[PDB]
Amino acid sequence: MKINFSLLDEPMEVNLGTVLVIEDVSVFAQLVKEFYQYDEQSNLTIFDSKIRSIRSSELLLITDILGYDINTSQVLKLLHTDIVSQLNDKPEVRSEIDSLVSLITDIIMAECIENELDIEYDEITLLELIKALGVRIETKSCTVFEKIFEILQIFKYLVKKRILVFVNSLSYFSKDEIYQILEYTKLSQADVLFLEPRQIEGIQQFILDKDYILMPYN
Amino acid sequence: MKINFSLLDEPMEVNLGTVLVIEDVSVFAQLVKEFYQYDEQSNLTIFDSKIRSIRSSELLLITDILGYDINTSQVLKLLHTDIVSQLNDKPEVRSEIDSLVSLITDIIMAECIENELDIEYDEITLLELIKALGVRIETKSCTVFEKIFEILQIFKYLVKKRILVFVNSLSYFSKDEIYQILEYTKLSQADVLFLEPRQIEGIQQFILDKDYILMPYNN
Amino acid sequence: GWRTVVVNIHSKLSYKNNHLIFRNSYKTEMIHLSEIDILLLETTDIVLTTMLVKRLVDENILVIFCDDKRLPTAFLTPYYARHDSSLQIARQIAWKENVKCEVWTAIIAQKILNQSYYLGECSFFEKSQSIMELYHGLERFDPSNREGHSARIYFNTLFGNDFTRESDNDINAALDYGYTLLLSMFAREVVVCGCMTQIGLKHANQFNQFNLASDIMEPFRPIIDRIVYQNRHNNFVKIKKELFSIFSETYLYNGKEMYLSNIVSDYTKKVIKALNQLGEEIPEFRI
Amino acid sequence: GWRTVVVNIHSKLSYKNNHLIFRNSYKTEMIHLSEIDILLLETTDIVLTTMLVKRLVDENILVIFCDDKRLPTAFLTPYYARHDSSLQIARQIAWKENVKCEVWTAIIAQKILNQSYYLGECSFFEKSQSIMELYHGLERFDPSNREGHSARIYFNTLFGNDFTRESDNDINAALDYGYTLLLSMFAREVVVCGCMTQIGLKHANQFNQFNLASDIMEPFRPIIDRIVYQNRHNNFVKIKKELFSIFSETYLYNGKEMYLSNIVSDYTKKVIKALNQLGEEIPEFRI
Amino acid sequence: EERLVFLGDNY
Ligand SMILES: [Ca+2]
Ligand SMILES: [Ca+2]
């Protein structure tokens, strides 16, 4: 994947982990504004290997790592649908689940018939059992280093998002933690792009000078 | 509004805008995690002049500037009330608006009398006119600087938030924009606490060295 | 090219699909290379690529690089503009002092005659009559220095007796600026001809790379002197803009009305052809 | 300055605090301005800034630009404080015919001697003895034309009697390719020396614009014919791949084993200094 | 069809 702005001479490719440093505060703030307004503004463009423009729905933009909720309605919907598909891939297990649900429905139905008030019921479904169990991704995060790892896991799980972008998220992590994040990104194959106001020492990054010239580092 | 952590020897007071720079990435990340988890963790303690500890509901934490939603039901309601007060402070404008609303009510009343069914109504007020106009703040085309300025303007509208805190928000703004933010914060009287890993040149700030020594810095 | 492109703003320049690509954070614009004659960079914040410089050398487009003060610093000179240069070097080495002194004397006579025409259009009878007397008194080897006297009387008559060419005033600064631009265009034309620019047609002792282009650009100085005389009260910026308006304005050649670039190109071509053919015809330019 | 900075890789150039910042994908290097002497750009992917161009104008360092073929195209010409190379070109215009004939005869003798020595390494005693006899029989003004006579013997020995330079074949195209690369290297060295490549050592033919470098690269020509003789059965693409390894391969200079770039640089410097000093010493290169 | 094209401040 490649990103192209009118400040760069040629579009730079983003593969696996990428660190982009902008030495101009105006170009950095205007670049983040172009990231949030990407749907509205046509200045900032992104061209994949197919050389096709991507909608803002396919771009994942995350600034605050701790403030980003891992559990969402769409994420829980895709997770519950995935578990329902996994249970549907095995006929015998789903048959046993239907038998147990039939037994529980028979017991609760007998208890309802024992009551003096009329009771009407419909049925119980596997999706209602998963939602009743509260299946969700683990919400326990001790530090931002683990939370960013969970963000990388959920990002690699989501097929619709072709790119993940972090804005000034490298200031919290230590150099060694940055090395572990880069190695985990190279192992996960996902495309991650970082935007930092200042350069980081010890790691390979693309430095954008105030002259607008882009130069590689390390 | 004093904040205290185990690293500091004494609780530091936060008045108007305050720029807190932590040169250690470990203490900075641990302090931010203690800011998000503040209700769970007893390490970071923020108290007012009454020494009473403020609840996490009274604390306002902000990291992403453009991702935060400035438009809320309470903010828009109190904003509409403020606009109604601004229109009420001028007698002539209120009189003219009352005249126009009277004319429109006369027209609609005639249209209701023309109908066969018996119809009743009450009034068309100014708050209902503002709610029908849909007055709200526009963050769509706003720059990050104007977004933070609008957040400092709506912080007075928020009743429950005791203190506003920004996480690494000073990296986007230029030195002059930071001077405008601080100078406006001195007029707004609100309590804002900024947390940055690197020190900003030209502004007064509290620096925490890797030695864990807190010192005031003019530049 | 017909178009002089001046970039005073910070931006990045690239070469894409035979097209000059101007990329800046506010807007991006593409300008074809075939329409572009001269490229002028007036600031030090402009970025360019060596591939676009190679495409500019192949397109034979003059590239000028200025300083932070916006005054021109250094221009790009291509090594080989055409294959006829290597064959023209032997002819330049075979040139004769009689043809050089004759062509240079005729050119100086055209310059002094243009100054007398400028003072005649300015309705000065004694000044243009004296400069015309110096034009009729010009001789080979220039023993009387009637050209320098014509320049001293020209500037002293136009700008006042207290004025001088050695002054640091913005008048002499604009004069040196226009002489630097016209010297850059004439030098680029000499590079198109292929002959050595360092070899002059007047004094063989003086060694300068701009000598020949200055000798070819001597008759056109009064065109800059006119706008410099009209805008002398205006600020140096407006005088520089009026100097830039000379490229948009057209002048009347003996044949017809043409642009300044075409008149300089055809004039330099007739000068080189006259030097190789030993004074067949001398091109004359009048205001 | 002293060190000559040449950029053969993609990179960006900036100027900060009297320090030239060269930035490449592998590493970043900062060089003092006073240490740099001549600056040359080998490829078209290099990015530079106009501010560093202005600092180079204040530092007088010569800026050399090259095309994709690596042949030098244009060079930066300042309006004032010109480089000493422009003053050195006048000596090249003053080169005597006796020194040019001596250097040319020495170059032809070196090339013929290298051809006969290469034929001796190929274990042909009669052809190498004949080419050596023509080498000992070479004289000034070239009335015998022993070089053109040794040509047919060298090529006829290498590729066979049926092969010739006039015929169109992958061997002839490979020879023109190797001669194009060597002409690019020697032409870049001559451009580094500042002397005009249009003026040749051979007085007969001025047609080629590279005549100086084409005459200087003759003693190294047979090293291409050796690899072309070994790879002659391979396709032209494989011959180009084999000829591309000559830059990485190391050759034996008279003094010490060195790379081809340093050897061509020292040979060109000795040739220029010998031409300006009128034959102090003639650089000799043997395979 | 403009002879002088200016990219920058228009003066
Ligand atoms: Ca109502
Ligand atoms: Ca409405």
Q: What is the 3-state secondary structure (H, E, C) of chain D?
A: CCEEEEECCCEEEEEECCEEEEEECCCEEEEECCCEEEEEECCCCCEEEHHHHHHHHHHCCEEEEECCCCCEEEEEEECCCCCHHHHHHHHHHCCCHHHHHHHHHHHHHHHHHHHHHHHHHCCCHHHHHHHHHHHHCCCCCCCCCHHHHHHHHHHHHHHCCCCCCCCCCHHHHHHHHHHHHHHHHHHHHHHHHCCCCCCCCCCCCCCCCCHHHHHHCHHHCHHHHHHHHHCCCCCHHHHHHHHHHHCCCEEECCCCEEEHHHHHHHHHHHHHHHHHCCCCCCCCCCC
Element (DSSP H or E) covering residue A78: helix A73-88
Nearest to E7 among C5, C241, C245 (CB): C5
The strand pair at C3-7 and E4-7 is best described as parallel
DSSP H/E element including C92: helix C84-93
Question: B114 and B12, same structural domain?
Answer: no
Q: Evaluate whether B181 touches B143 at the Cβ level (below 8 Å).
A: no
Same domain, D63 and D118: no
Domain count, chain C: 2
Q: Are residues C80 and C92 in the same domain?
A: no
Quick check: B73 contacting A, CB < 8 Å? no
- Is there a single domain that holds both residue C204 and residue C215? yes
Q: Please tell me whether residue C9 adopts helix, strand or coil conformation.
A: coil
| Rounded Cα–Cα distance for residues B23 and B212 (Å) | 9
Strand partners, C7: C41, E7
The reply to whether A59 and A82 lie within a common domain is no
Same domain, D27 and D75: yes
- Mark which of C26, C50, C85 sits at the end of a domain: C85
Q: Which of C62, C85, C108 is the last residue of a domain?
A: C85
Half-sphere exposure of E11 (CA within 13 A, CB side): 20
CA distance C50 to D42: 10
Residues C214 and C72 in one domain: no
At residue B123, the 3 state secondary structure works out as coil
Are B65 and B77 members of one domain?
Answer: no
Q: How far is the CA of A3 from the CAs of A49, A193, B164, in angstroms?
A: 11, 10, 35
Which of A134, A157, A179 is at the close of a domain? A134
| A201 DSSP assignment | T
E3/C247 touch (CB, cutoff 8 Å), yes or no:
yes
CATH code of the domain in which A17 resides? 3.40.50.11940
Domain housing A120: 73-134
In this complex, whether A and D touch, counting 3 or more CB pairs under 8 angstroms, is yes
For residue A90, the domain's CATH number is 6.10.250.2340
Residue D138's region, left for phi above 0, alpha for psi from -120 to 50, else beta, is: beta
Q: Determine contact, residues A214/A13, Cβ cutoff 8 Å.
A: no
Neighbours of chain C (3+ CB pairs under 8 A): A, D, E
Write out the residue range of the structural domain in which residue D158 sits. Answer: 86-287
Query: Are A27 and A86 found together in one domain?
Result: no
Among D85, D111, D144, the domain-final residue is D85
Give Cβ neighbours of residue D29 (< 8 Å, ≥ 6 apart): D21, D22
Cα separation, A196 vs A178, in Å, equals 13
| Token pair belonging to B162 | 């005791």
Which residues of A are less than 8 Å from C45 in CB distance?
211
B65: three-class secondary structure by DSSP:
coil
SS3 C116: helix
Whether residue D216 sits in one domain with residue D81: no
Residues 6 or more apart in contact with residue D39 via CB below 8 angstroms: D4, D5, D6, D56, D61, D62, D63, D64
**Cβ-based burial of A53 (10 A; exposed 0-12, middle 13-18, buried ≥19):** exposed
Rounded CA separation A115/A102 (Å) = 20
C58 and C147 belong to one structural domain = no
Whether A34 and A140 map to the same domain: the answer is: yes
Residue B132 CA, ligand 2 centroid: distance in Å: 5
- Both D56 and D125 in one domain: the answer is no
Spatial separation of the C-alpha atoms in residues A43 and A33, rounded to whole Å? 11
Q: How was this structure determined?
A: cryo-EM
Contact C73 D79 (CB under 8 A): yes
Do D100 and D150 belong to one domain? yes
CB B185 within 8 A of CB A182: no
What total number of domains does chain B contain? 2
Strand partners, B60: B164
Nearest CB to E3 within list C2, C9, C31? C2
Q: Are strands C28-32 and C19-23 parallel, antiparallel or unpaired?
A: antiparallel
Same domain, B139 and B129: no
Q: How many CA atoms are closer than 13 Å to the CA of D207, on its beta-carbon side? A: 2
Same domain, C146 and C169: yes
Are the beta carbons of A27 and C27 separated by less than 8 Å?
A: no
Phi/psi of residue C276, nearest 5 degrees: -75, -35
Flag whether residue A98 sits within 8 Å of chain B, measured between CB atoms: no
In which order are the strands placed within the sheet that holds A192-196?
A59-62, A163-167, A192-196, A17-22, A205-208, A214-217
Q: Do D116 and D18 fall into the same domain?
A: no
The CB-based long-range contact list for D241-245 (8 Å cut-off, 24+ gap) reads D243/D174, D243/D177, D243/D178, D243/D181
**To the nearest 10°, the Cα dihedral for C229, C232, C234, C235?**
130
CA atoms within 13 A on the CB side of D144: 14
Same domain? D214 vs D188: yes
Two structure tokens written together for B27: 């203490």
* Residue A119 neighbours by CB distance under 10 Å: 10
Based on the fold, state whether residues A82 and A155 are members of the same structural domain. no
Quote the tokens at residue C169.
Answer: 């005033």
Does residue B10 sit in the same domain as residue B54? yes
> How far is C112 from chain E, CA to nearest CA, in Å?
30
In angstroms, the separation between the Cα of residue C108 and the nearest Cα of chain D is 23
Report the separation in Å between the CA atom of B70 and the middle of ligand 1, taken as the mean of its atom positions. 28
Rounded CA-CA distance B54/B59 in Å is: 7
Indicate the DSSP class of residue A53.
B
The answer to whether the annotation marks D166 as part of a ligand binding site is no
Q: Are residues A37 and A111 in the same domain?
A: no
Pair B104, B147 in one domain: no
